[PDB]
Design an enzyme around this catalytic site. Structure first.
Site, PDB file in Angstrom:
ATOM      1  N   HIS A   1      -6.469   7.432  -2.743  1.00  0.00           N
ATOM      2  CA  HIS A   1      -7.287   6.413  -2.093  1.00  0.00           C
ATOM      3  C   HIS A   1      -6.700   5.584  -0.989  1.00  0.00           C
ATOM      4  CE1 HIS A   1      -5.654   3.109  -4.305  1.00  0.00           C
ATOM      5  NE2 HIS A   1      -6.354   2.332  -3.514  1.00  0.00           N
TER       6      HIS A   1
ATOM      7  N   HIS B   1       0.825  -1.214   0.000  1.00  0.00           N
ATOM      8  CA  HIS B   1       0.000   0.000   0.000  1.00  0.00           C
ATOM      9  C   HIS B   1       0.861   1.268   0.000  1.00  0.00           C
ATOM     10  CE1 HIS B   1      -3.236  -2.843   1.236  1.00  0.00           C
ATOM     11  NE2 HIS B   1      -3.885  -2.069   0.383  1.00  0.00           N
TER      12      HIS B   1
END
Ligand SMILES: COc1cc2c(cc1OC)[C@H](Cc1c[nH]c3ccccc13)N(C=O)CC2
Ligand SMILES: COc1cc2c(cc1OC)[C@H](Cc1c[nH]c3ccccc13)N(C=O)CC2
Ligand SMILES: [Mg+2]
Ligand SMILES: [Mg+2]
Ligand SMILES: [Mg+2]
Ligand SMILES: [Zn+2]
Ligand SMILES: [Zn+2]
EC number: 3.1.4.53
Lengths: 320, 324
Positions: free
Chosen positions: B113, B73
């Protein structure tokens, strides 16, 4: 002090002299009323909460309600707590809620408006506030009230839930979040529709609520009713609440006017109609909610509904 | 080096862009260079009067707020989701369907996001009583945080890329971006997929053959699912890309599992490096999540996504073949 304890004997009654209690307690109505209700319901022994921890948390929580905010302060919190306390004892709801559910509702009520700045969610969104940025414009105040209420448990000798298991804690936390988020007025219509659905489908012996979804819906509506209970109280109390909410609204409208923003409804002191606003408030919001609630617990809410209708009639008569 | 980078960025309209190469060639700035390329390709700087220096400053600040020490991530993931969304927006079935503002919202949402993702799940943050879970009341904890950071960074010096949008434009974009990023919470996947299926079954197409979306609810629903599909697009990519994404997500999962094990917690699914089956986990991921989603998206835009679906099915077969 002795009059303070005298006033606290009406803790199970709708109409408690909350403003008197606030004065007698040295501006500590949330603390004394919460302490009284916990004793009355035997919650300290049931959940093994140490008296000093309780008091310590309560005073810290009460300190996080703003004293310069006319309506959304510690007196309002105390009122909602006590109101919830009464509604939980409705005969039609006997045997419905577990003890953990009772503790959740009462705790939720206590923290439901903590650290309220005295302005609306829409004001916070429109002024690009830090709060609205943190919470992505969604139930901004209510998310903040929860976060503060729970964060304060982490202060020295403030963990009133220290003797609950992790599972009980996790269940209580979920219930408290679900109830507080439901006090956002933008959710009122959906909530009321659900309460209506439940009334049309109701099973009784006393109300019989088998699943969690129905039970949390009832608790959500209960605390919401308690939040919207001012017009159902004895008129002398109701008029004081009206004075305070109008003062708070007008201070918001003054900040909006200074900033050049459009003034929010009911917030313009140069153009208000306090009495017409109360009648419209009752007609479109408070009476539909309490009439539906009264049906759910029929006929236990009758005296409450009678007072609301008396008060609506009186406010209407003050309009020439 | 700059020549090769430029060459690779010519592939920005293609599924299977060499995004890990672009990350190295750009000096670990894949999000900045891919976003800049897409904004130029779509003429978004001109359309929205975005100063180029403001765009680059915001992109570099946003990219900095992805964690370089998180295996999956991170900024490469962000860049990949941005580019994947950019390709999905160009599908023939959506020609002239979305406004420039909706296109901007979907691409911006993709970019922010996962910003400031700590490399552990929402459930981990809840179960460990983290500050983030306390702030956000256990509800879409990470995704609320990604939004708050992505928007807050616009207020830094020379970072407001939306400075020349109208007030109504900024208000509409903010709402769309919030709706899109909140839909990347995996706890919303089942309901979101259920809804997308309902749309497919009732879909309306115009006389040009494109999707007919005539209300906000349907429009935002498509954009939500589009970004979600992009977020879940690793198994639809050429296998050499997919395997690198699998290596990275498993490193990240294993590190979370090490924390759980140490704390006495039950280890989360796929997070135990002593009892892992990486290959079976990919086949299950595809079978129960990624193929149900992508088969439905492919139905919505049929037959635009047939090659992507074919790659997904080939990669599922490959991973399955490694098991026996
Ligand atoms: C004593 O009287 C009141 C008390 C309260 C309110 C309004 C009152 O009187 C008009 C409003 C309710 C409300 C929220 N949005 C609205 C939109 C239209 C009408 C009412 C509301 N509250 C908070 O802000 C709760 C307390
Ligand atoms: C390349 O492979 C992957 C990539 C990703 C995931 C899982 C992968 O492979 C099993 C998970 C999906 C997921 C979230 N909760 C879950 C619960 C069960 C199963 C999957 C998930 N992600 C983040 O957490 C997104 C990226
Ligand atoms: Mg409130
Ligand atoms: Mg960083
Ligand atoms: Mg995410
Ligand atoms: Zn309140
Ligand atoms: Zn992601």
């Amino acid at each position: 002090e002795d009059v303070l304890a005298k006033e606290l004997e009406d803790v199970n009654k709708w109409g408690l002299h909350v403003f008197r209690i606030a004065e007698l307690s040295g501006n500590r109505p949330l603390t004394v009323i919460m302490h009284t209700i916990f004793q009355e319901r035997d919650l300290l022994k049931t959940f093994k909460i140490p008296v000093d921890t309780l008091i310590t948390y309560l005073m810290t929580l009460e300190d996080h309600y703003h004293a310069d905010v006319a309506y959304h302060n510690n007196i309002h919190a105390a009122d909602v707590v006590q109101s919830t306390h009464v509604l939980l004892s409705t005969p039609a709801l006997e045997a419905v809620f577990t003890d953990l559910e009772i503790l959740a509702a009462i705790f939720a009520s206590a923290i439901h408006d903590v650290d309220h700045p005295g302005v609306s969610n829409q004001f916070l969104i429109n002024t690009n506030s830090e709060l609205a940025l943190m919470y992505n414009d969604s139930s901004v105040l209510e998310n903040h009230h929860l976060a503060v209420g729970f964060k304060l448990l982490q202060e020295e000798n403030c963990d009133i839930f220290q003797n609950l298991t992790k599972k009980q804690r996790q269940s209580l936390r979920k219930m408290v979040i679900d109830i507080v988020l439901a006090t956002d007025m933008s959710k009122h219509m959906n909530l009321l529709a659900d309460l209506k659905t439940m009334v049309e489908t109701k099973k009784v012996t006393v109300l019989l609520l088998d699943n969690y979804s129905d039970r949390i819906q009832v608790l959500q509506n209960m605390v919401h009713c308690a939040d919207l209970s001012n017009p159902t109280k004895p008129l002398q109390l109701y008029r004081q609440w009206t004075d305070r909410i109008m003062e708070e609204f007008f201070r918001q409208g003054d900040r909006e006017r200074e900033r050049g923003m459009e003034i929010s409804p009911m917030c313009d002191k140069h153009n208000a109609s306090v009495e017409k606003s109360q009648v419209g408030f009752i007609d479109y919001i408070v009476h539909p909610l309490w009439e539906t609630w009264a049906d759910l617990v029929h006929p236990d809410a009758q005296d409450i509904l009678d007072t609301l209708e008396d008060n609506r009639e009186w406010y209407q008569s003050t309009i020439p």
